[PDB]
A paper describes a structure:
In Fungi and Apicomplexa, the second to the sixth steps of the shikimate pathway are supported by five enzymatic domains combined in a single protein known as Aro1 or AroM.
Nevertheless, we were able to identify a subgroup of particles corresponding to dimers of full-length Aro1. As implied by the crystal structure of isolated Aro1DHQS, dimerization of the full-length cryoEM SPR structure of Aro1 is mediated by extensive contacts between the Aro1DHQS domain, resulting in an arrangement similar to the one observed in C. thermophilum AroM homodimer. Notably, we did not add any ligands to C. albicans Aro1 sample used for our cryo-EM analysis, nor did we observe any evidence of endogenous ligands in the five active sites, in contrast to the crystal structure of C. thermophilum Aro1 that contained numerous ligands. However, each individual active site is more than 40 Å from each other and each face outwards from the core of the dimer.
Author numbering:
A (entry chain A): 988 to 1550
B (entry chain B): 1129 to 1269
The structure:
């Protein structure tokens, strides 16, 4: 404590972006810090900014004085919300040390974009208007803590607007005007002048929050929204008569929770979807999981945990099928068809129905998601994004420099080859039980996806940088023979290569929780091993994003498979 | 039904002229609602098909015109709120059938059709407990 504090005034001025590391207790807390660091470093380096979500997003309005109070339920607070609206004014301390501590306790539990709102008194906040200097200095802590969306008011000083529009970096700007009185209707030219203040300052999104004295004022909002289309518009009324304007809003509807001080009567995530269904935005759809041995699939338990948390009106069930024509005349052609999640004996046959296959569906040769689109159906393979996101959730970087190893030629063998190439492995090394189904994988994959086949034991010594292995042998045979000798000299060159992570193996079989290959890579040569309960979730997480358009609540769907 | 003293006879706007003129020349006092439903469900609420069927109702001296759509999205319910603004000569009933046209049934003043649990129901009209709950959940009550 002696050596740190004397350099705090020389570290925090000589840096144009800050970041905060803390002591993490659980592995979920470690994971959220290294996930919110990637989107931070995708923002402050400037590669891919989060571009203003094109679906129907929402934003949780954290109205707490200190977020260590509601700290365990914060993963339950941020459910269905695609951004976090920190209101910086209503912190108990508006100091630079406190706001950076409250941003520290949210990237540990929520890997979400932060909307840095310093709302002033004339627009409904607890920050004063007469101290302009600590407002300009607060929005500059949003640029330098790497938040995603900064809040610049439009009835603000014009030196503050042109300072957090020339020094914004890659933190996007939302421009707000609020009618606290309610004397403007949505035909007055003051709303047109505020949209043109958003177009002229080159703000990314514009916010126009009115106040509804009748239900007609919600339909005057939607006639303003279709006459003003250049910059995206978060426009919604307030009061207890403007609930249609928050329900019908597309980008960044403010939501709240039971555990938060909801004062501007914002809806919860259940009440927003329940009202969107009763006015006809959603339909009661039916999703299915199809395959021959479907008696213990554990996929309907995952999705039904997410529809319940978000209050969407969908159901997930099973349909035993062996042919693809019974899927089309019992599930697909019905008007309540929502999508499919296709399992093992039917992955190859459902590719004939996708009029738009993704690039992963062509390269792998199996489709496990069939959602309807305009004029046909869309086919995606989310098994590569389950083999991948199981690695990224256990500390492997998304674009690291290591090498891989696919042990087996099973049903998931081709996705694991594809997931290893778009991981960043410079070379994939196939090592199989028997060499019969071996060379077919190289003739059916591009030479860019180099699959150097290991054939002898001396070749294991030339196999370099293997720290992202995947095992997809069936877990019926304890490992022996020619195959065991190939792997044991492969995993031995493990942690000493040090590519920024600990060497990782991912077992792909769900039901054998401790596979013999999971013992040998962990109890002998010290790797991090991941069970196949993690792949069944992360395959289902991207199917949940594809089926519903909504990010799935992870602890609610993880604690639906693990029982 | 005119002879039995019903209060709202219901001609259709696509009826033959010798039946719209026969009913509307001896209605006496029974008001005429003039209907045209889009049963296929492709005409959005900005065609000249909906201006004509409205204008057929004003031309036949109908006291209410009914114009019933079918919603394929939530925009056809907000397309209907702009059609009722432009046409307030005669009283208008205008809603969008289907599961995606529930908002146009909640936001409709004159004679919103409802149904009950002890009746057969095919066009998915809400009850009085759901029409007043959704009108509360969007902030009219």
């Amino acid at each position: 404590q002696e050596v740190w504090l004397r350099r705090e005034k020389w570290y925090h001025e000589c840096s144009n972006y800050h970041f905060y590391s803390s002591h993490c207790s659980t592995e979920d807390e470690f994971n959220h810090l290294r996930r919110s660091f990637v989107n931070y470093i995708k923002l402050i380096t400037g590669a891919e900014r989060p571009v203003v979500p094109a679906g129907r997003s929402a934003a949780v309005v954290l109205t707490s004085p200190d977020l260590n109070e509601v700290v365990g339920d914060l993963e339950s607070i941020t459910i269905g919300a695609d951004a976090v609206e920190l209101r910086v004014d209503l912190f108990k301390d508006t100091s630079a040390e406190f706001v950076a501590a409250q941003i520290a306790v949210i990237r540990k539990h929520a890997d979400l974009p932060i909307i840095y709102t310093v709302r002033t008194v004339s627009q409904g906040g607890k920050f004063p208007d007469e101290n302009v200097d600590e407002l300009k200095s607060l929005l500059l802590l949003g640029i330098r803590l790497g938040v995603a969306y900064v809040d610049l008011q439009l009835t603000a000083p014009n030196e503050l607007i042109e300072e957090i529009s020339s020094k914004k970096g890659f933190t996007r700007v939302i421009g707000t005007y609020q009618d606290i009185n309610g004397e403007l209707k949505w035909n007055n030219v003051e709303w047109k002048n505020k949209y043109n203040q958003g177009v002229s300052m080159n703000a990314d999104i514009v916010r126009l929050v009115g106040k509804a004295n009748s239900i007609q004022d919600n339909l005057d909002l939607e006639n303003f929204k279709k006459q003003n289309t250049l910059k995206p518009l978060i426009a919604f009324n307030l009061g207890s008569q403007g609930k249609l304007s928050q329900v019908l809003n597309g980008t960044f509807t403010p939501i709240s929770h039971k555990l938060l001080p909801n004062d501007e009567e914002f809806l919860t995530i259940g009440e927003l979807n329940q009202t969107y269904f009763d006015i006809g935005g959603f339909t009661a759809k039916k999703f299915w999981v199809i395959g021959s041995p479907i008696e213990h699939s554990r996929s309907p338990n995952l999705h039904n945990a997410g529809y319940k948390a978000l209050n969407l009106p969908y159901q997930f069930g099973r349909f035993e099928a062996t042919d693809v024509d019974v899927v089309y005349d019992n599930l697909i052609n019905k008007p309540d068809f929502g999508g499919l999640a296709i399992t093992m004996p039917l992955k190859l046959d459902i590719m004939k129905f996708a009029t738009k296959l993704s690039d992963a569906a062509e390269t792998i040769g199996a489709v496990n998601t069939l959602i309807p689109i305009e004029g046909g159906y869309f086919g995606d393979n989310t098994d590569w994004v389950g083999i991948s996101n199981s690695f990224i959730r256990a500390g492997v970087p998304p674009k690291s420099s290591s090498n891989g190893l696919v042990v087996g030629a099973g049903g998931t063998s081709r996705a694991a080859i594809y997931a290893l190439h778009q991981m960043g492995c410079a070379k994939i090394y196939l090592v199989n039980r028997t060499a019969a189904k071996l060379e077919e994988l190289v003739k059916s994959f591009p030479k860019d996806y180099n699959l150097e086949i290991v054939e002898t034991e001396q070749q294991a010594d030339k196999a370099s940088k293997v720290s992202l292995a995947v095992s997809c042998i069936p877990a019926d045979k304890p490992l022996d023979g020619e195959v065991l000798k190939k792997i044991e000299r492969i995993l031995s060159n493990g942690s000493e290569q040090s590519a920024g992570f600990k060497p990782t193996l991912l077992e792909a079989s769900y039901k054998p929780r401790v596979t013999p290959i999971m013992k040998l890579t962990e109890e002998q040569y010290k790797w991090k091993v991941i069970p196949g309960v993690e792949m069944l979730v992360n395959q289902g997480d991207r199917q949940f994003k594809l089926h519903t358009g909504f990010t799935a609540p992870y602890e609610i769907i993880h604690r639906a498979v693990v029982e």
